[PDB]
Each structure stands twice: as C-alpha cells, then as structure tokens.
Design a protein around this ligand. Structure first.
Ligand SMILES: [Cu+2]
Ligand SMILES: [Cu+2]
Ligand SMILES: [Cu+2]
Ligand SMILES: [Cu+2]
Ligand SMILES: [Cu+2]
Ligand SMILES: [Cu+2]
Ligand SMILES: [Cu+2]
Ligand SMILES: [Cu+2]
Ligand SMILES: [Cu+2]
Ligand SMILES: [Cu+2]
Ligand SMILES: [Cu+2]
Ligand SMILES: [Cu+2]
Lengths: 279, 279, 279
C-alpha cells in the first residue's frame, strides 16, 4: 500500500532480555521483565536483516531453553539438550537470532528471506522436545517483516495449545476488541497433541505468506478456515467489520467437539460509540 | 479461457427460499422446496457482487439456523443463538448474504473478493455450534464466481462428514458419471470430528483458489491428495479422463482405515458408447 | 538458475524392472533388482513427457500391485483389484506411466503438467486399499521434473508411515549427512492412519510446487513446519547450513508425543573437515 504504514528496511542489531519463570499456579511463561511473564510470551517483531541478541535467564528450578522457528541461528543457539544449548536452573545464556533479505545466489537461484509469522518455545522442559514446557505455556510469537510489508493497528496472538486457547480454561476466551475499520493482525500458532481448524466469523484472508493478496494476480485461495497442527504458524491482517459491520464475531476451532468443549472466543468489533449490535 | 464458458460480471439482487426439515429416517436437510430436502443441501452459486436474500423457514420442532462461510453478512444473519439470529420451530427469517469484487482500498491495499468455494450449515441444532445439525445433514455448498472464471459442465459435491461421505452408509458411494472430455467441477467439504485426506485416481488439480493454473507462472503445487479438517472447503475442475481415458476411477479418503471402513466412491468416466473398460 | 544444473526437456521412453518381495523380518519392499528391495522403495525420477514401462514382478505369496499418484496412467495400470490390474503371486505385469508438459488446451485453458513430488505404493495387500502392503513397507517416491527445474546434489526420502520414519524402530533415524553448501532435496511422504507435522531445525522452504521461490513475486508462505496426512507428498530443496553453518540439525514430527516416542532424525551438516560442532 501507499497510505498504510509499511515496514522499513532492516539491519539493526538489537539486544533484549528474556526470562522463563514458573507461575504461581503451576504454569510456565516467558517475559521481557522478571515478574511480567505471560502465556503467550511477548511478541518479538523484527525486520529482515535485523540481528537479535537475547540475554536469556532461566529462573526456574529445572533446565529450560529457547528455541525459534524460521529465523537464522547457529547450532549454538539451538536451544536443545543434545547440542548443549539449553540453560541450567538460575542460569543465563545469550541466544542469537539472525534474519536475512531474499536475493540471488551465485548459482543464479533465489534465496528466500526470513520474512514471515514464526514462534519460539522451550525444547527441554519435561522431555527433550519441550513437551512439558510447551504444555505449561512456554511459547510465544515472532514476526519478521519484509521491507514494504503493511503494518497493522494491533496484533493479536491466538494459540491452540492442546485443547486450550492460550492455556485458558474452557470458554474463557480470550476476546479481542476492535473498532470497525481497524487493521487487525492475527498470529495463529498451534501446539501439543492435536490438529485443529481455525475459523473466524465475518472475515477472511489469503492463504499465503502475509494473509494479503498482492494484487489481482495472486491465485492464493481466500479462506476463513484453516487446518493446523503442532508447531504450525501463520498470520494475516483483516479490516475489522469490513463489508459486514460491527458485531460480536466468533472465532473458534471448527472441530465440533473442540468448539463444544470450549475452544471459542470473541472478536468484538465496535461502532465508534463503542456499541456492539445485540450484545 | 476463450472457448470455455466463463462467469459474467455480478451485481444481481437475487431472492430465494430455503427450508430445513427433519427427514423420515432421522436426518435433517435443507431444500429450495418443502419436501425436496437433500443431504448435501442444494448448491447455491452466485457471481461476485450479487446479493442474496434467503427466505429461510425452519419447519422442524427444534430451533435451527443458517450459517455461511466466506460471504459478507451482517451480524443479523449470523445464524447463531448468541446473536439472536437463529430460527424458532415453524419460524421464518430472512438471511442476507452479500459478495464483493476485489479492488484497491483507499490506503492503497488490495481487498480480496468473495470468489471461492464455500459452504453453509446449521449453527444451533444439538449444540450452540450446530454439532447435531451438522451430523444430521444440515450442510450444503456455496460457490462464488469471479468475473471470467471458467464454468464447468457439471458440479458435484463431496462432503466428508465424520466417517461418511454425504451422510451415506459405508460403501454406498456416491458415484458420479462423466463422459471422457467433460469439464467436471468438484466442491469438497469436510465436517465433524476428524481430519481426512481426499484422493482421486487418475486426475489432479491445482492447490489454489480455483483448482486451475492461470498459466505458466502459477507456482501452486499440483496434487491429487489433500488433507482436510472440519469446515474446510475447496474446489477444482478437471477434464474427465484427460490423458488417461475412460474407466472406473476411485476416489476415497486415503486415511487407511477410513477407506477400509467405507469412505470410497467411483468417478465413472465413460466412452461415448457409455462403456467403461473392465467394469 | 543459470549455474546450478537444471532438468532437460523430457520425452524419452524408458523401461524398467521392479520387484515386490517379502523381507526376512516380515516387511515388504520394492526393488529394481531381486534381492535388493528397500523401504522406502527406490526413487523413480523422470522428465515431463517421459513414458515409463515397468516390468513389475510380484515375488510374494499373496497378490500385490503397483499404484502411482499424479502421473498419467490408463485404468489398465490402475493397480487395483476392482480394475483387475493387480498381480498374482509369482506373476508379472507391465505397468505404464506417462507424463506430460503443461500447455494450452483448445478451449483456451491451461493444462497442468505432471511435474511434482509423487509416490507409488501397493493397493491390494491386506485390504483392497493396500493397508497391509503400505504398513509393511510397499511405498516409494516418484519425482517428475519440469524442463528447467533446479537439480540437487542429493535426494533424500522421508516417509512418516504410521508412527515410524521409513518403517524404522523408534529413535533409529534415519540420519542424513551433508557438507555445508550442498544442495539437498527432500521428498516427504506420509502413510497410514495419522496426521503429522514435519519440522526441520535451521532450514526452511517454500510451500509451493518445488519448495523454491521463483523470484520476488512468489507469495508462497516460507515455512519449516508442515502438517501432512496419509498419502500426502511434497518436496523441496535447501542449501545445507545456509546462513546457519554446520551442526547436527534435528528433524522430527512436531506432534509432541510422536517426537517423544521416537519420530526423530538428524540432518548432519559438516564442515569440509567432516566435523560437526558439538557432536
Ligand atoms: Cu525440535
Ligand atoms: Cu481444535
Ligand atoms: Cu463460520
Ligand atoms: Cu518447534
Ligand atoms: Cu461458528
Ligand atoms: Cu477420512
Ligand atoms: Cu491413488
Ligand atoms: Cu462453519
Ligand atoms: Cu486408491
Ligand atoms: Cu507425527
Ligand atoms: Cu524447531
Ligand atoms: Cu495412494
């Protein structure tokens, strides 16, 4: 676009602290600040070409780690036990993530860039595949922008983790709010044991990298329903209420017993007066 | 194409009656006419820009509704209990579905059009997610054509609903018939509890919006096998017997115990004399 | 590309022998030579336009067959019981597979070519859907190249067959080896009863036909995680260790209990001295 904000060229070196901690109720979560850990962990958004040094501190009583999808990392920052890149209790390690722009290789072929919707999670809590860590909440989203990507007003993360959304008790959302016309970005991630189908009432997106059609040539299927499995991640943007107006629009897993057993939430799209028709 | 028939520009306002009724054997189905209800319900095909007013009448003894994927609807035509848009027994409600062409937004971005393979189903029978209604047969296909889309000779709907095809008893098809050379469109929909993989012997299509490659630039994978989950919908066209000739070509779920337990049917492609080699 | 090797135009008629045999331990596998049967069966790679005549011999004590995805075959070479194209014990049959280039049809539309990542398997051992044959190991990969496709240094086949990789005992790989910079092709196939998610540490590919982006216009999502179901097949190429260096990079099903129960292997990327950092 040319009036929406778009991502700039990347290439910063960025530093950042993360903590893994046990939560009072038995869950585990990441944070940028000790005592401010969340499930999902905080969004990490960078631009293609950025380099990110994460001073990670495991504050728990068991070994834990930080593993990322899609981004360039050396085996040093694998986050696995095998490759000795996990972290002892109370320990601190610096993971490094790099990203790159697309371009021609010398053999004439086209190297894909790092741009996309990704995620990070533990790889050593409970099992050598982080099964316990993931079940407990050690997962969070990563976004890598390509230069020129359209930027949203807000970004929400929805994680189907086993039979929960964002580790919440059945039928407790989360719910999100927008005003009609808002540019809303969704990062959607699945974890655990089961397949799901993500569905949104009243909105749809493109089944490509960005969730947006480039222009009239993009043959990508347009959808409002997408099957997902453990560690899948995709994202998209929509205009809230576009062509459909305000309302309490559901989103849910469309697997019938999942939605029945509580994998449901609300996308509350409001008129400017903050009202929602019949809610 | 330029010799195949193609869809015209849309923009009609269309009216239409639908009924939901209980069938003699305990199933539930939609119809355009009372007493002519089917599972799957009738195809609804429109053009991008069309508006469709459906005079829906619930003739059953329990509340029922009509919910659609992909198409523009206001929350009034949500078809959910929450938003008060379901229908009392013997009641009548007018749902409205709109569709739109793609184009530029003012922010410079590209709005996707409504064009695609979609579906409709109940959202309130049995549970607040229509689990009972869907299991009983309250589902049907919707097609939205983009101006210039290639039109087929015939359109067949295949629905993997839990462990059945089109709610049929195991190993009872459906079977479809074509003559070699026919342009056959398939709308494929999944419902219920399970994932599946749809497979066709002897034919293949594009994994994009239409199931057809635009021309040589379309990088879409060409496939004869596709994993699907509850509420997924896609469609495609093939030339019957193209490059392979007449025959009784199977289609089935490729999940091994599903095909074994009966999720199988026949695509009977005939020579002009109506014969099928070795059948 | 223009320095990588690329596939030539097709159109050869090729002949070839295959055998199905029972293995000493109770499995079943295909081979190009009697006594040299493998699970997965040997790669069959051809060019668009090639024709392949396979002199198939069933050396087992039960009926068996050869069924292929994606490629053109007449119903004579269906490989099914129904269509009488399976093979009696000790019997010999000649299957024929053809392939075609894409191009314009007379109706003006675009016929897709045969190019892609496909597979072959039994259709009659154990059940009329080859459930027993597939479980026992009667499956192998097929690659059809389009003229101009980039050719790799090596091609590896990974098959998630029920809860095994390539029918191996849990936690026994397979492992693959490359040197940093190698062009590695992966053909990934799923069989049996379950869905999976294929994941690779440290590498990513395009979710299109080839696994490679054409250039900057290709909107295909770039991924390192892909959900798959029975009879799904896709493929891709990566540069070993590109942007990430040498190391013992894991690949696994990301379904948590699968990786835990053993669906894991190693992509061993080496420095030229053959060493792998921390292994
Ligand atoms: Cu891993
Ligand atoms: Cu679910
Ligand atoms: Cu819906
Ligand atoms: Cu992961
Ligand atoms: Cu719903
Ligand atoms: Cu199935
Ligand atoms: Cu097949
Ligand atoms: Cu639905
Ligand atoms: Cu079959
Ligand atoms: Cu698995
Ligand atoms: Cu990983
Ligand atoms: Cu098959």
């Amino acid at each position: 676009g040319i009036t929406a904000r778009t991502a700039p060229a990347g290439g910063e070196v960025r530093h950042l602290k993360m903590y893994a901690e046990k939560l009072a109720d038995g869950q585990m979560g990441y944070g940028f600040e000790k005592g401010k850990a969340s499930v999902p962990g905080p969004l990490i958004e960078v631009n293609e070409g950025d380099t990110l040094h994460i001073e990670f501190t495991n504050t728990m009583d068991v070994r834990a780690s930080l593993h990322v999808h899609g981004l360039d990392y050396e085996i040093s920052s694998d986050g696995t036990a095998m490759n000795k890149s996990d972290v002892e209790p109370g320990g601190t390690r610096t993971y490094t993530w790099r990203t790159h722009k697309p371009g021609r290789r010398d053999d004439g072929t086209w190297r894909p860039g790092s741009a996309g919707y990704w995620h990070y999670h533990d790889h050593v809590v409970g099992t050598e595949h982080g099964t316990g860590g993931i079940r407990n909440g050690l997962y969070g989203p990563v976004i890598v922008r390509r230069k020129g990507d359209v930027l949203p007003d807000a970004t929400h993360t929805i994680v189907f983790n086993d039979m929960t959304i964002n580790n919440r008790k059945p039928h407790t959302g989360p719910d999100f709010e927008a005003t009609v016309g808002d540019r809303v970005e969704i990062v959607m991630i699945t974890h655990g044991e089961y397949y799901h189908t993500f569905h949104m009432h009243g909105h749809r997106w493109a089944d490509n990298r960005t969730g947006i059609l480039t222009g009239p040539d993009d043959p990508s299927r347009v959808i409002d329903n997408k099957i997902t499995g453990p560690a899948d991640s995709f994202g998209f943007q929509i205009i809230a209420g576009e062509g459909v107006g305000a309302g309490a629009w559901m989103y849910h897993c469309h697997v019938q017993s999942h939605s029945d057993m509580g994998m449901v939430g609300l996308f509350l799209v409001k008129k400017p007066d903050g009202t929602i028709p019949g809610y």
